[PDB]
Curated annotation (Swiss-Prot), chain A:
ATP binds at G153, P154, P155, G156, T157, G158, K159, T160. Interacts with UBR1 and CIC1. Keywords: ATP-binding, Cytoplasm, Nucleotide-binding, Nucleus, Phosphoprotein, Proteasome. Its main location: cytoplasm. The modification Phosphoserine is found at S67, S134. It comes from Saccharomyces cerevisiae (strain ATCC 204508 / S288c) (Baker's yeast). The 26S proteasome is involved in the ATP-dependent degradation of ubiquitinated proteins. The regulatory (or ATPase) complex confers ATP dependency and substrate specificity to the 26S complex. This is 26S proteasome regulatory subunit 7 homolog. GO terms for cellular component: cytoplasm; nucleus; proteasome complex; proteasome regulatory particle, base subcomplex. InterPro entries: 26S_Proteasome_ATPase, AAA+_ATPase, AAA_lid_3, ATPase_AAA_core, ATPase_AAA_CS, NA-bd_OB-fold, P-loop_NTPase, PRS7-like_OB.
Curated annotation (Swiss-Prot), chain B:
The lineage of its organism: Eukaryota, Fungi, Dikarya, Ascomycota, Saccharomycotina. This is 26S proteasome regulatory subunit 4 homolog. There is a cross-link at K160, K181, K216 (Glycyl lysine isopeptide (Lys-Gly) (interchain with G-Cter in ubiquitin)). Keywords: ATP-binding, Cytoplasm, Isopeptide bond, Lipoprotein, Myristate, Nucleotide-binding, Nucleus, Proteasome, Ubl conjugation. The 26S proteasome is involved in the ATP-dependent degradation of ubiquitinated proteins. The regulatory (or ATPase) complex confers ATP dependency and substrate specificity to the 26S complex. Has ATPase activity. The chain holds residues 75 to 436 of 437 of the full protein. GO terms for biological process: nonfunctional rRNA decay; peptide catabolic process; positive regulation of protein catabolic process; proteasome regulatory particle assembly; proteasome-mediated ubiquitin-dependent protein catabolic process; protein-containing complex localization; ubiquitin-dependent protein catabolic process. It comes from Saccharomyces cerevisiae (strain ATCC 204508 / S288c) (Baker's yeast).
Swiss-Prot record, chain C:
Coiled coil: none annotated. Present with 4700 molecules/cell in log phase SD medium. The lineage of its organism: Eukaryota, Fungi, Dikarya, Ascomycota, Saccharomycotina. May form a homodimer or a heterodimer with a related family member. Interacts with OLA1, TMA17, and UBR1. Belongs to the AAA ATPase family. N-acetylated by NAT1. It comes from the Eukaryota. The 26S proteasome is involved in the ATP-dependent degradation of ubiquitinated proteins. The regulatory (or ATPase) complex confers ATP dependency and substrate specificity to the 26S complex. This is 26S proteasome regulatory subunit 8 homolog. It is found in: Cytoplasm; Nucleus.
Curated annotation (Swiss-Prot), chain D:
Disulfide bonds: none annotated. There is a cross-link at K23 (Glycyl lysine isopeptide (Lys-Gly) (interchain with G-Cter in ubiquitin)). The 26S proteasome is involved in the ATP-dependent degradation of ubiquitinated proteins. The regulatory (or ATPase) complex confers ATP dependency and substrate specificity to the 26S complex. N-acetylated by NAT3. It comes from the Eukaryota. The gene is RPT3. It is found in: Cytoplasm; Nucleus. This is 26S proteasome regulatory subunit 6B homolog. Belongs to the AAA ATPase family.
């Protein structure tokens, strides 16, 4: 019965909370959709009363002086509709309106494919981590860190796994927005509503947002669409507007995801909204030898096993495809009931998984340029 | 009760007085609004079809966990400040979702398929009630399973028996209605299903016969119809982009998933391959013999007579041959079926759904 | 008539819905109506043949 | 439709009913519901019909293929008059 006795001190403090309400007691009783108050009784020009709603739409040309002495009446005055700025009396302005935002904390992902990502992750570190360490080298040399970056390749073979792993070491705000749900219906639901997230990115610093599912946003057109994809294409152009006139690159990052690099609008892929591109392909053999180690760090393996002959059975592959070999190898200890992971389990798994199980249904010829 | 004398004495004195303080902040409209966002200064946002305008500040009785962005709450009578919170139950307003029931299922009619029956049990039923072996080994078990072939022949009926063997919450989501002519309805409803149900660990979602999604060809995004390719893009976020702890499980049983498969499955999130297999002499006896456990028929007729020479009759084909021959014998009100109804029911089933490609020799 | 039950008619073309699909929920909504009255026969209309 | 019950020699003609054809939802109550509450009342005010049988309701339309098929049920709309050229 904690909540039972918690209200004992809270109801007594509710009057203390009401003491702040005692400033304005009129009209009965900071994120806002549109700025709305009741009559704004408090308030050249002295008092300032503006409201936008179905009744009594107000507008004032002047401002920037103290009528209200900070908050007044309905407490909501500030940025809405754009066009409207009350700044001088401690504004609750540029605040997220009613919308759908996905905000999580600590997207913890460990290392997946280090085989070809040795110097490839360093390019990702030069995006976010670089301005957070030695910003003085940017003003002296005259160079700026990359903002936009593109991810292309097979669907999450250790490419996407690396994208979520580096973001965990950034220690900043992580927000995931996709492109599939972005369509919706109303014009502006996929652009103006997301523009509020882009406008807040300049307000709240230390924010990192990964743009997802760009195939549902961009893409090349010939007949200029069959209809219904115009807003899909206008959202592509709305992303350009935030990068068009002005934008800081310090606290704002741009990263895409797709299966092929050039499937977007060839004008969209033009540089300046993408400074660098992530080239993701099948790395060499000895480079992926650390992948077999990472999965075996927490895995009990018989001492004396030789990984040299195991890697020979496996041709060029990715990080996730190597875990599938150990995944079925873990199933070899289920049915056949092996104590630990042996060499015969790994040598057979490559022929069991890649040769035996995998067979068809893989991405091979589906990426050239386009 | 014992404490009703001693401990209750310095209790009810403050229990009734706080209720009067509630009547001061409640009244009896109890207006039900919607809380859009939580403010560290204890202030809320009112929502109502009358378009309310309020600066109301968050009162007591609610906490940061109870207050939710967009779920209904209780309001003050005059000032309309937040008081309580609405309790969610019954059926949400999202797309079709089953809640719970206990089916009666086991391995009986699909007997003889045990070669592929014990395979799916290892990656589904075993990593549920015994959450172990991943601490010592360290390899993450697969998420769902993928089955391609003829459904209802005992391959999909296998999934119906596994649902009861889990002894936990089972979910069934429809994968048809996503193909609606409207653009953008696919990725929306699919995300809200797994997000709201993430509280309950067991899910095991089953989907049947998706022939639409999966158009890719040479590029990732083509100029084809947008009613199809973008709907699939949501499934990439569930199986790859955003991964759970192993609660949500997606199962899709269709005819041919070949072209469909490597836009979704990924290397190692879901590893399963199960195809329809022609039963041998031993499997056909266990399928047909167990169906007759409760069935009664003429003792002068052997059940293995038609098993020797027959063309591709699975458990689905036998389900009709038992019903078709049963309705003919039931017309005379007899629990036993004669021999003439056995061959008569096999012809009309073989002459309709069963057709080969007329490919001989080879 | 002779089966001692009811008759439920369901519009096929009206079941198809754009925007947020209603027909997806209309499946389980009619299932509740099918649960309320056990002696009934659900019929699929507008996909049938009147000619 | 109340005057149709009072004065018997009355003819009510509604031109261009094709303004609504199949259906729409979108905003729900906003800019939609107006004709959806009519359909319920088209099943209501026409229920009091057949008492006098003096009521005359004739609806004009262009494309009849996308209209409501449920209206063709007897008691609301019985027989449609085709207007070809020929």
């Amino acid at each position: 019965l904690k909540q039972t006795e918690n209200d004992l001190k809270d109801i007594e403090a509710r009057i203390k909370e009401k003491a702040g309400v005692k400033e304005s007691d009129t009209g009965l009783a900071h994120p806002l959709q549109v700025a709305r108050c009741t009559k704004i009784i408090k308030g050249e020009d002295a008092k300032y009363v503006i409201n936008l709603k179905q009744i009594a739409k107000f507008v004032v040309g002047l401002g920037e002086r103290v009528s209200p002495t900070d908050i007044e009446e309905g407490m909501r005055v500030g940025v809405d509709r754009s066009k409207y700025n009350i700044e001088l009396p401690l504004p609750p302005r540029i605040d997220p309106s009613v919308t759908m935002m996905t905000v999580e904390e600590k997207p913890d992902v460990t290392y997946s494919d280090v085989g070809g990502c040795k110097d490839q992750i360093e390019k990702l570190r030069e995006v976010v981590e670089l301005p957070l360490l030695s910003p003085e080298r940017f003003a002296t040399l005259g160079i700026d860190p990359p903002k936009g970056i593109l991810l292309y390749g097979p669907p999450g073979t250790g490419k996407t796994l690396c994208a979520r792993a580096v973001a965990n070491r950034t220690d900043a705000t992580f927000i995931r927005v996709i492109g599939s749900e972005l369509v919706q219906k109303y014009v502006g639901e996929g652009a103006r509503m997301v523009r509020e997230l882009f406008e807040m990115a300049r307000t709240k610093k230390a924010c990192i947002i990964f743009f997802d599912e760009i195939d549902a946003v961009g893409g090349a057109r010939f007949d200029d669409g069959a209809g219904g994809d115009n807003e899909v294409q206008r959202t592509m152009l709305e992303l350009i507007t935030q990068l068009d006139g002005f934008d800081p690159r310090g606290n704002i990052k741009v990263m895409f995801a797709t299966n092929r690099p050039n499937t977007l609008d060839p004008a969209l892929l033009r540089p300046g909204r993408i400074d660098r591109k992530v080239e993701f392909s099948l790395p060499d053999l000895e480079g992926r030898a650390n992948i077999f180690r990472i999965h075996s760090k927490s895995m009990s393996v018989e001492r004396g096993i030789r990984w040299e002959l195991i890697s020979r059975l496996c041709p060029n592959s990715t990080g996730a495809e190597l875990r599938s070999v150990c995944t079925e190898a873990g199933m070899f200890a289920i049915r056949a009931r092996r104590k630990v992971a042996t060499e015969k389990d790994f040598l057979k798994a490559v022929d069991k998984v890649i040769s035996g199980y995998k067979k068809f249904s893989s991405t091979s010829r589906y990426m050239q340029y386009n | 009760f014992v404490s009703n004398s001693e401990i209750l004495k310095p209790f009810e004195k403050k229990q009734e007085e706080e209720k009067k303080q509630l009547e001061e902040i409640r009244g009896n409209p109890l207006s039900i609004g919607t809380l859009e966002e939580i403010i560290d200064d204890d202030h809320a946002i009112v929502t109502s079809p009358t378009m309310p305008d309020y600066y109301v500040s968050i009162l007591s009785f609610v906490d940061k966990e109870l207050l939710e962005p967009g779920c209904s709450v209780l309001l003050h009578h005059k000032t309309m400040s937040i008081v309580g919170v609405l309790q969610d139950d019954a059926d949400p307003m999202v797309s079709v979702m089953k809640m719970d029931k206990s089916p009666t299922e086991s391995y009986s009619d699909i007997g003889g398929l045990e070669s592929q029956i014990q395979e799916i049990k290892e990656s589904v039923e075993l990593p549920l009630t015994h959450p172990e072996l991943y601490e010592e080994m360290g390899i993450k078990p697969p998420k769902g399973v993928i089955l391609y072939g003829a459904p209802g022949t005992g391959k999909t009926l296998l999934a119906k028996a596994v649902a009861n063997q889990t002894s936990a919450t089972f979910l069934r989501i429809v994968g048809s209605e996503l193909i609606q002519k409207y653009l953008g309805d696919g990725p929306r409803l699919c995300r809200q299903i797994f997000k709201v149900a993430g509280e309950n660990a067991p899910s095991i979602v089953f989907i049947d016969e998706i022939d639409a999604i999966g158009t890719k060809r040479y590029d990732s995004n083509s100029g084809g119809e947008r009613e199809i390719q973008r709907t699939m893009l949501e499934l990439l976020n569930q199986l790859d982009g955003f991964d759970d702890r192993g609660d949500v499980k997606v199962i899709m049983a269709t005819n041919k998933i070949e072209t469909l498969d490597p836009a979704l499955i990924r290397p190692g999130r879901i590893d399963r391959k199960i195809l329809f297999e022609n039963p041998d002499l031993s499997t056909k006896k266990k399928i047909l013999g167990i169906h007759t456990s409760k069935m009664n028929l003429s003792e002068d007729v052997n059940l293995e007579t038609l098993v020797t020479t027959k063309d591709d009759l699975s458990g689905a084909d036998i389900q009709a041959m038992c019903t078709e021959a049963g309705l003919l014998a039931l017309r005379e009100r007899r629990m036993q079926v004669t021999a003439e109804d056995f061959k008569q029911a096999k012809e009309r089933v073989m002459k309709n759904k069963v057709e080969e490609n007329l490919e001989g020799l080879y | 008539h002779h089966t001692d039950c009811k008759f439920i008619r369901v519009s096929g073309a009206e079941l198809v819905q754009k925007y947020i699909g209603e027909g997806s929920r209309m499946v389980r909504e009619l299932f509740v109506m099918a649960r309320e009255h056990a002696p009934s026969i659900i019929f699929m209309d507008e996909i049938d043949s009147i000619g | 439709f109340r005057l149709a019950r009072e004065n018997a020699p009355s003819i009510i003609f509604i031109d261009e009913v094709d303004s609504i054809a199949t259906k729409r939802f979108d905003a729900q109550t906003g800019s939609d519901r107006e004709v959806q509450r009519i359909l319920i009342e088209l099943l209501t005010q026409m229920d009091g019909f057949d008492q006098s049988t003096n009521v005359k309701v004739i609806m004009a339309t262009n494309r009849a293929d996308t209209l409501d098929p449920a209206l063709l049920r007897p008691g609301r709309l019985d027989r449609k008059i085709e207007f070809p050229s020929l």
